[PDB]
């Protein structure tokens, strides 16, 4: 546990391997008023493992108006060009549509918040 806690300090993708090191990261999050970084990021994971070409195009376009489109509620700051490139990927919805827009997410959290979090009382409190 205190094991655990260090290994999240491994990398970002260790951190994001752990459910506790994803609850851990959030709260932190939550504190910067950044969440919709992950929140985004994991919508992403989830969208991945969707089978059905229904329900493919149906949460494409949930996850698309949430996080990436103009006005969306959890506006994620990535660049415009990004952003374009993933609404013309919704015109043909597939399993890729977000792959552009969550690796800029990931990079986002990886060399803002994640060093910060290392930092962190929360997360030196763990060992
Ligand atoms: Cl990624």
Redesign the pocket.
């Known amino acids: 546990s205190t094991e655990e806690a260090t290994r999240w300090a491994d990398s970002f993708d260790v951190l994001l391997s752990h459910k506790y090191g994803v609850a851990a990261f959030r709260a932190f999050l939550k504190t910067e008023f950044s969440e919709e970084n992950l929140e985004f990021?994991l919508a992403?994971e989830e969208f991945k493992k969707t089978r059905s070409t229904a329900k493919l195009v149906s949460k494409a376009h949930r996850i698309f108006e949430e996080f990436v489109d103009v006005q969306a509620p959890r506006e994620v700051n990535i660049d415009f060009q990004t952003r374009e490139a993933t609404r013309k990927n919704l015109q043909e919805p597939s399993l890729t549509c977000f792959?552009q827009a969550?690796?800029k997410?990931?990079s986002l959290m990886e060399k803002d918040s994640y060093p910060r979090f290392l930092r962190s009382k929360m997360y030196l409190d763990l060992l």
């Open positions: 990021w992403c792959d969550q690796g997410v990931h």
